[PDB]
Each structure stands twice: as structure tokens, then as C-alpha cells.
Write a protein that binds this ligand. Structure first.
Ligand SMILES: [Mg+2]
Ligand SMILES: [Mg+2]
Ligand SMILES: [Mg+2]
Ligand SMILES: [Mg+2]
Ligand SMILES: [Mg+2]
Ligand SMILES: [Mg+2]
Ligand SMILES: [Mg+2]
Ligand SMILES: [Mg+2]
Ligand SMILES: [Mg+2]
Ligand SMILES: [Mg+2]
Ligand SMILES: [Mg+2]
Ligand SMILES: [Mg+2]
Ligand SMILES: [Mg+2]
Ligand SMILES: [Mg+2]
Ligand SMILES: [Mg+2]
Ligand SMILES: [Mg+2]
Ligand SMILES: [Mg+2]
Ligand SMILES: [Mg+2]
Ligand SMILES: [Mg+2]
Ligand SMILES: [Mg+2]
Ligand SMILES: [Mg+2]
Ligand SMILES: [Mg+2]
Ligand SMILES: [Mg+2]
Ligand SMILES: [Mg+2]
Ligand SMILES: [Mg+2]
Ligand SMILES: [Mg+2]
Ligand SMILES: [Mg+2]
Ligand SMILES: [Mg+2]
Ligand SMILES: [Mg+2]
Ligand SMILES: [Mg+2]
Ligand SMILES: [Mg+2]
Ligand SMILES: [Mg+2]
Ligand SMILES: [Mg+2]
Ligand SMILES: [Mg+2]
Ligand SMILES: [Mg+2]
Ligand SMILES: [Mg+2]
Ligand SMILES: [Mg+2]
Ligand SMILES: [Mg+2]
Ligand SMILES: [Mg+2]
Ligand SMILES: [Mg+2]
Ligand SMILES: [Mg+2]
Ligand SMILES: [Mg+2]
Ligand SMILES: [Mg+2]
Ligand SMILES: [Mg+2]
Ligand SMILES: [Mg+2]
Lengths: 149, 64
RNA sequence: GGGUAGGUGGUAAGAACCUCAGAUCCGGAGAUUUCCGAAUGGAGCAAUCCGGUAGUUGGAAACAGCUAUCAUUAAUUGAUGAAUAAAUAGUCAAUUAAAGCAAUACGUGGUGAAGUGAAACAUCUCAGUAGCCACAGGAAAAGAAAACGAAUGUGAUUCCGUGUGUAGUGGCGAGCGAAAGCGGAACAGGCCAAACUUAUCAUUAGAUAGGGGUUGUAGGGCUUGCAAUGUGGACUUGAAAA
RNA sequence: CCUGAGUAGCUCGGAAAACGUUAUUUUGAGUGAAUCUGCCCAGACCAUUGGGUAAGCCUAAAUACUAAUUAGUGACCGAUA
RNA sequence: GGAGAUGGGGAGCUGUAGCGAAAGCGAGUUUUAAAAGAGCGUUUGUUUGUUAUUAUAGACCCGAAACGGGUUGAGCUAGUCAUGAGCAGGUUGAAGGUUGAGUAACAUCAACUGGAGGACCGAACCGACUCUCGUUGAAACGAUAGCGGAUGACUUGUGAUU
RNA sequence: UGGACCUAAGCUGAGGCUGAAAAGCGUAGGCGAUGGACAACAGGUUAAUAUUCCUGUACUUACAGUUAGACUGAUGGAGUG
RNA sequence: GGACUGUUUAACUAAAACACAACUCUAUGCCAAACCGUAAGGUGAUGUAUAUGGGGUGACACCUGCCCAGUGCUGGAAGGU
RNA sequence: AUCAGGACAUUAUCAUGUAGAGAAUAGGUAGGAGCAAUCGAUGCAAGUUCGCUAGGACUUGUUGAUGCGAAAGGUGGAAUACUACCCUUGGUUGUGUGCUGUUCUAAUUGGUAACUGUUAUCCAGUUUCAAGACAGUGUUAGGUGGGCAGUUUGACUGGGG
RNA sequence: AAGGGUGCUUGACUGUGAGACAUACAGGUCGAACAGGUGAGAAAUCAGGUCAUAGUGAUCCGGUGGUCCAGUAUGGAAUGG
């Protein structure tokens, strides 16, 4: 069914476009990831009339996303020291959402679908790398330090 | 019960006709499947609805 | 209030009283109404046991009297509040309703057999009957044509007679059996959504509260005029009368 | 400009109507329309003619019954009834 | 209208024209090329009362073994679970252990200790193999005399449960 | 001897799960002895009651006042039971 | 005849019948197979192939022969329906 | 969701075929008497495919304006260049369908573990692990199915069988 | 002769059918005669299967051919007769 999409996707479209994609990828992947949007103003001619505002809406959500990037790039010392044996046993057991217990609410939201971190989420006792993608062009680099309490 | 939670549409009782027209009572059950419906960005309850109601929600932009 | 000269319920005599400041008796309106029972403070082997809370009176206190309250669910409101910042889940409090029963009877809906008949039996019949369950009401259900149906036709629903045991439907067997039309009982038609417009919600409203509208020989909205201040309701409070 | 969409239709299994499933009505699974030059119906179906406006709601009366209250009746019974 | 006879109510029903599957024709019609032939017709009504028979209802009365639907029963009994209790008395004397002999060291043998067994005899207790009696009994299953088990796969009380 | 104390099998069971309906299962709680904990013995008396009434001698648990000493220590942990 | 001790048709059959320790085959890798229900739930089992369920035989000793045509079970390339 | 594979149709593109005779590898039906040259020949070098060991065709590089007996000779049932339609077979960028084969997670599942509601083995929420478009469930359609149910299983007969 | 041979042919016809046999019914058997158009024969006459009696199965259901009937508002079609 017809869906207009917001961000950049490897297939289908670039920014605004109308793609006929199956509902499985739309209601379960494209919609929760903010990579697409349902029928704009509920029809096609309605979409055409409202596209003259959707462009600026895309501009301003990108603008606030850039503001969100600045907010992480400002205060960023969000730290965490683990309680382990330390010398022979070193591994971060915080998963991801313990770190999201220090981003969303306390500081810049940094939603779970926004941070494109790997599946190991850091397993070291030293400064590491956090990658977050507000958009398809912005790359976020965070350096958290670790250790023993 | 094996029924929808949005609507109240339930099973349909009927006959199981075969060759020689032998009568045996049977029950048609609704295609109950689990779905999660957001409501004002919160309370994403995992309700058990039929596929027909699921299609209605999908065409209504998940409105219920 | 009526109405009197007797009354104190029956097996029922006697003893002792009441009653003419109007008794007993009959009618209307009230008062009290132990315990169990939907039973609902908790339990339980029904008519029992064990309590909490807030008052008040005795005691020097434990305690004991005398009161009121204390179930669950649903809806509304307010407070508090997890995993986890916010927010929900949850918790608490207040208010309002629900519980159950019976009329061996009628209504609606869900589920739903078998004996039997077909001279056996499986389709079929029995029968959508019995039974089981849910919800009522004083009736319920139905109801204002996306209709009948073959015409210069009728014009919500319901019930009665006929149409007829007809057209039809049936291992075309046992059987089942209307819908039109006609004659009667009664008769009533109303109201929302959308357009359009008003006000307000970080007005992303796609939401809330109003005006406008309710259709078929199409209706309504948009713009522009004439005529209207009535008739009638399935309608609220009162007053009066029969 | 508005006139009720997972709706009417269609397919696969059932059923309601007198009908043993079929034009009409309904639905468990799937699919799925149009917008007064529109849609549905007149026993498969098509064309002409005609009829009616589905997918929203409420509706007294005539109708069904008597556990009970008052009055009364019976070619009903009269202690095995 | 008296829980009336009845009056209104002609909706309808039977007869008046039949024949044919039917359109259709008509004292004719169907069959057929036929008019011939043959089949059916070319007339005798209706509404009630009474009696007889018959159809639907349980249909003259009494009688099944049954079938389906609902409830009540594990206080008897069968199993399982929880918690208790009981088995008078007397015998046999395992494994094992100690000591001594013995063995190169084992094995083996002797004495003592030890008290096991779905062990033995036999009461309460449990069960019911036999004769007799009873068979409208004392008793809807027992009595006398014998009989099997009797520390166990035992017996039993209370409570729960299928 | 049993409640005002406690639990076994099992029953009930707010929420909750499952199921056309009735209902079934089940968590927290609550019941449930045939078990556990808890202080009284001897004699006499009436026609009928007696560790219950009477005589004699005891014990237990609460509350208040008082004297002396001591810091008191559970809805939870551990031991015993 | 049954290895044995035992169990059985309350109220005509206590036995050679059933059971029993033992043998063998088969299924089951754990949310296990099997089983009660419609499902939830539960037994198996708070167990893990030295374990569980089912079929057959029935101490101990010696043995258990031939047939895979038919039926049952397991596996199988392609090919035909 | 993505990747790879072969299959059937074709948008665009090439070719592909030997009875003899016929200067020769003749798939059929037409117009058909001229045709080629910077949409560049003779000679040469290489290559995929094909094979009748001879040949067809496509592609690249030099070459340079002269040629076609494969128009006109001639043979043959079918005859030659050029422009079209119709058959066997192969490759190609490309879409349309499913078929087995992988990977991924967000649907969904868990009788993995943890936290919270919560003094709580259930349940709910949030994770984590393990699976994963499988599984489970609904509808439809085959196979097996005395586990279960409703019934049938005749009459004559020197009684019945 | 109703047996054998030869020639020509297809009456092994169409619509019927007064009257009888035998029969519970359903069915069966014989048949004069009429109309149409034929075959044999000069004609009269004969031919509606064989010298005669066995050689056969109701209804329902569906299929095939023809058809001067119906065609659910009308024209067809479907579906029937
Ligand atoms: Mg039946
Ligand atoms: Mg008075
Ligand atoms: Mg029957
Ligand atoms: Mg019968
Ligand atoms: Mg009979
Ligand atoms: Mg009503
Ligand atoms: Mg229709
Ligand atoms: Mg029916
Ligand atoms: Mg119209
Ligand atoms: Mg019609
Ligand atoms: Mg409409
Ligand atoms: Mg009496
Ligand atoms: Mg008497
Ligand atoms: Mg009259
Ligand atoms: Mg005549
Ligand atoms: Mg007369
Ligand atoms: Mg017992
Ligand atoms: Mg013994
Ligand atoms: Mg207790
Ligand atoms: Mg006790
Ligand atoms: Mg005494
Ligand atoms: Mg024995
Ligand atoms: Mg014995
Ligand atoms: Mg016996
Ligand atoms: Mg005996
Ligand atoms: Mg299960
Ligand atoms: Mg377990
Ligand atoms: Mg044996
Ligand atoms: Mg043997
Ligand atoms: Mg053998
Ligand atoms: Mg073999
Ligand atoms: Mg096989
Ligand atoms: Mg579980
Ligand atoms: Mg699936
Ligand atoms: Mg099947
Ligand atoms: Mg069978
Ligand atoms: Mg059977
Ligand atoms: Mg029967
Ligand atoms: Mg016989
Ligand atoms: Mg005989
Ligand atoms: Mg004889
Ligand atoms: Mg001859
Ligand atoms: Mg002859
Ligand atoms: Mg038939
Ligand atoms: Mg017609």
C-alpha cells in the first residue's frame, strides 16, 4: 500500500517519495523507526497539498535532531563503573538500557531506535565508542570511560 | 473466551455436512491473533483481536 | 377516619381484668422489626463463633456496657506512586449503581438431543421441541421499504379469517408447506453522521461543546427574496374539576 | 459540495426462509467496489422499462399469559370424586 | 347484544363447461395429415342437523427390555493421600564384627558376640477352604466344629479425594 | 474435650489465566485434626452432676500500682521444636 | 500345574486364574514420549537414558530352530497416480 | 527485509538448421532484379558457441577502393542480394510468478535468567537469553483412524442352524 | 405343408382400433376394420416380424434427438413440458 517515507532508505526512495511496500515492512519496521509515514492528510491529493508543509516539517525535525546532536556533544561524561572482580573478570554488564537509563529523561533522549550501536555494547574496562544515528547523514561518537567502583 | 476484545464477535456454530449428508455439529472459531495498539503514546496493551479487526485498525492508522 | 356496647385469637369452661373521657372490631398512613438467608467485618458444619475502627459511660487499667461503621465488582473524581527520568501499571480515599428471589405463566437470544415415524435405516421426520444458560419487561419482540410485485396497483410493524392443504419443496418416500391479493382489529411517525458555520484545545485535531440536516414525484448545504407567528406531539412542572 | 467502507459484492464451508441451499437474508476464513449520467431490486444472467434509497438510532395501539386482589358464574366434583 | 338466539359483515367457498402437460379452443376438446377412429364431456345444486367410517393428534385400555437430557450419591465398597493406633506368648539363630589357628600375605576353619528374615508354632485381629444345620431364617449370607495368614505386598480409626 | 493458638492431605480463593453460557484452573490470603503447643491433684457430697459443686493444698496467663535491678531489643534472620 | 509369600468374582466358582522378583522388545534428549481436559492447568517429575511409558514372557538351570511371500513397522533415490 | 540459483513468457538485441545435384550447411511463406563502401570490403591475427574435422555465424585491431557466377551463369521439389512474417536451439542486459538454499530482525513464541507490582512458584510490565518469519492458532482440502458413535446383517423350511 | 431352392424387396411401416381371452391390481394375449404411403404379384390376395408357447425389470433420478408448449415486468437465455 502507498506510503510516503521520511528518511533515506537503501531501496525504494530518497527523502520524499511514494512507494508501494507490503504492510509487513511498513507497520512493523518503517513506521516505528520513523523511516516512513502513513497517508499524509489521508489521501493522495491531500498529500500533494500538504507536501508544501511536509518539506518544512522534515527540515525542522532535522534541525532539532542537529540540536540533539549538539546536546550529546556538549555534556557527555555519562559514566558507569561496574562491580566485578576487576583483575581477571572485566566486562560491562549494563547491556544498553542501563546506559539509556542515563540518556532519555536525564539528558538528550537518544531513543533506542536512534543509537545504532553493535550487539556487544562494549565489554572493556577503558574508553569505548558509542555510535548513534539521528538521521542518515549524522554520525554520533560518544566516549564513555569504565572501571571498578 | 475465544472472542475478540475490541468487538464481541465470537464463534459460529453450524453443521458439518459430508457425503451422505450426515449431520455433525461443529464450531467455527475466529482467527484470534495478538496485536499491540498504541494509544496516545502509551499503554501498548497486547490485545487479542481477529484479523478482520486488525485490517480495520491498519486502514484506520491504528485507531481504536 | 368509620363504627358501636361489648372485649381479653381456635381446640375453652373457669380465674383475673379492660370498656360509654368511647373499648374490641374495619379502613388509610406510620413506629418497632432478634438471628440465618443476595448476606456483604472475617470464618463457618445456616439460624453459630471470632473481631477491627471512631465515639461515649463506669474502672486504677486490662476490661465491660450503649451507639455508628467496616464485603466485592463497575463508573466518576482526587491523592499517592514501580521496574525507569517522565508516564503508566499498581495502591488508597470519597460518591453513585449492581448483586438475590419468584408467577409450576407469557418474551428475546445462545446452545441443543433422543424415544418415535418412514411399518428396517443412514438423507429426512420428530424439532429448532425437551433440557441447560443469559437478560428482562409489565408485556416482550418487530417496525417506517436499497419493500411487495405486474398494475392507469398497495404504501411501517403486529394479530385474526380466507387465499389452500394452493404454487412449490421432499431416499419426489414418510412428510413439510408459504409469499402476494382480499376482508377485519389498531394506527404515528420521529431523530442522528456528513456537508456549511461558531468557540476552544503546544489547534500538527484527525478532538470537545453549539447553530444547520434527515431525504426518493431525490433531499440537504452555497448565494438571494417572499410568506410565517401559527398547529400539533410519543412532551416538564404546577393549579382546578370530574 | 454532502448523503452512513473492511461496507455492498465475489470465492471457500454453513445456515434463514415452505424449500433438503438458491434469486432474496445472514456469517467462520480470504479478497474487495462506485458516488445521483451513482447504487440495490423485479427467482440463474444480460439489455429495455419500472420500483426503492443498504452499510445509524428510537417508536404507543391492536398481541401473549395469570401466582395475586374484588365481584360472580357453571346441563363442573361432592370424600376411591 | 345478556359469557345469548340474532342483526350487520359477500372476504370467500361449492355448483353453473368441458378437454388438454400447456399456450389454447369451446358443446366441444385431446391424439393425428384427418373432421375418420378412439379417450373425456354434451348436467343436476347448496348450507346445516344426526348417524357410520376415515385422516392428524397419546386416539379403546393396561404392559416392556430400552434411548436421550439433567441432577444426587466414595458414610458400604475399590484405589490414592494425610495423621494416629494394634499385633499375648514362645522358638530358629543369617549377614556382619572380635579373638585364635592357618596363609609369604589371601582364602579357609574354630569359639564368642550380633539379632536379620515378604522366617516357624500359636491367641487377640484379618480372611473365608470343608461337613452339618437354616432356606416363609436368629440372619436379604449366619451358627457350631474344624481351617489360612498372623512384623508384613499386614490390620485398623479419623479426615480428604477420583 | 474443642474454639479465642498453629499447620498436613485437601477445600475455598480478590486479582489473573482458560472456556459458546453455566463455569474449570489457580497466586496472595483464609479455612481445614485424625497431629503440635498450653496451668489441678486427693477426698467427700445428691435419687439423678462432678479433675466442674464442697473441703484441703496448688499452679498458669493477662492488667494496674509499687520496690529493686537492668538498655529494650521484631511483622525479619538463625537454632530448637 | 503354578517357582515361592501374596491378590481375586461382598452374597454358589480361591484355582492351574491375576500379581510377583527376573528376561526381552519398543518409544522417549526434556516445553521428552505417554495421559486427564475443549483449553488453561496438571501427572510423568521438583525425575534426565543406570530415567520414564507401553507390548509380551514369568524364580533358578539349559535352550529359543527355518520363512520378510501376505499384513504391520522403519527407511528410500528418482519415476507413475 | 536481503542475497544466490536455475525454470516458463517476453520488452531491446543477435544468431541457430548439410538426403543428392547444386562452384555451397537450401528451416518455410512473400515483395522481389539489382546490390556494397567513414552504421567502411579484398589479405591477415585472436576469441565464445557449434562441428559433418570441413564449414556457418558474431566481436575486436590494421587495411584501403575496389567488387558480387550466392542478382543476372547454372542446378534443383524448394535459389541466392535487399526489405518482412512463421518454426528447432543458445547467450544477453530486463521485468512477472512461484521452487528449493542461505543470512538479518522488528511480527510472533518460550515450562532460560533478573528486576518491579509484591512479605507472591500464578499473572502483568520491563529487560536478557534462545528461537524466528519458522513455529503455534483460525479457515479450507487430502491420508490414516472400531479410539468413539448410529445402524444393517432376508425369506421358504415336516422346529432352528 | 408351416420343409428346400430361386427372383424382387424391407410391412422387422406411420396414426389408430370395434370386439374378445385371461386376470385382485399393475401388466399380458388375439384381433376385424379405417386413413396415409409402399413391397411381391397379371390379378385375386398377402405383408403392422419369424410353425406356437421362454429370450425379460415398475417407479424415481439424470443424459440424448426432435418439437407448432411454457419462458416469473418486457425481448432473449437459463430451466422445464
Ligand atoms: Mg438427525
Ligand atoms: Mg378512633
Ligand atoms: Mg432417529
Ligand atoms: Mg422406524
Ligand atoms: Mg414400525
Ligand atoms: Mg420494544
Ligand atoms: Mg444481489
Ligand atoms: Mg430449515
Ligand atoms: Mg436514481
Ligand atoms: Mg426477471
Ligand atoms: Mg443512503
Ligand atoms: Mg381425596
Ligand atoms: Mg374412603
Ligand atoms: Mg352471524
Ligand atoms: Mg367423438
Ligand atoms: Mg336439498
Ligand atoms: Mg477407602
Ligand atoms: Mg511370617
Ligand atoms: Mg484454625
Ligand atoms: Mg486432636
Ligand atoms: Mg452417674
Ligand atoms: Mg501359587
Ligand atoms: Mg497362598
Ligand atoms: Mg463368592
Ligand atoms: Mg468359596
Ligand atoms: Mg499441555
Ligand atoms: Mg514436578
Ligand atoms: Mg503368562
Ligand atoms: Mg509357562
Ligand atoms: Mg521363534
Ligand atoms: Mg521385503
Ligand atoms: Mg512405508
Ligand atoms: Mg507453567
Ligand atoms: Mg506460520
Ligand atoms: Mg479432515
Ligand atoms: Mg470404521
Ligand atoms: Mg460399533
Ligand atoms: Mg433409531
Ligand atoms: Mg425363518
Ligand atoms: Mg430343518
Ligand atoms: Mg418335525
Ligand atoms: Mg425368399
Ligand atoms: Mg418361414
Ligand atoms: Mg435416486
Ligand atoms: Mg422473462
Amino acid at each position: 500500500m502507498k506510503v510516503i517515507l521520511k528518511q533515506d532508505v537503501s531501496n525504494l526512495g530518497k527523502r520524499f517519495d511514494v512507494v508501494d511496500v507490503k504492510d509487513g515492512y511498513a507497520i512493523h519496521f518503517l513506521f516505528p523507526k520513523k523511516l516512513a509515514a502513513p497517508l499524509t492528510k489521508k489521501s493522495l491529493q491531500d498529500r500533494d497539498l500538504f507536501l508544501k508543509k511536509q518539506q518544512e516539517h522534515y527540515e525542522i525535525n532535522k534541525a532539532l535532531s542537529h540540536k540533539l546532536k549538539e546536546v550529546i556533544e556538549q555534556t557527555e561524561l555519562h559514566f558507569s563503573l561496574k562491580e566485578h572482580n576487576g583483575r581477571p573478570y572485566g566486562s560491562i554488564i549494563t547491556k544498553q538500557i542501563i546506559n539509556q537509563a542515563h540518556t532519555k529523561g536525564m539528558a538528550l533522549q537518544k531513543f533506542m531506535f536512534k543509537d545504532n550501536v553493535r550487539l556487544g555494547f562494549g565489554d572493556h574496562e577503558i574508553t569505548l565508542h558509542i555510535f548513534e544515528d539521528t538521521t542518515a547523514v549524522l554520525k554520533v561518537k560518544v566516549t564513555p570511560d569504565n572501571g571498578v567502583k | 473466551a475465544k472472542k475478540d476484545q475490541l468487538t464481541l464477535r465470537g464463534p459460529l456454530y453450524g453443521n458439518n455436512r459430508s457425503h451422505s449428508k450426515t449431520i455433525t455439529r461443529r464450531k467455527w472459531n475466529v482467527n484470534l491473533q495478538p496485536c499491540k495498539v498504541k494509544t496516545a503514546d502509551g499503554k501498548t496493551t497486547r490485545i487479542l483481536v481477529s484479523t478482520r479487526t486488525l485490517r480495520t485498525l491498519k486502514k484506520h492508522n491504528r485507531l481504536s
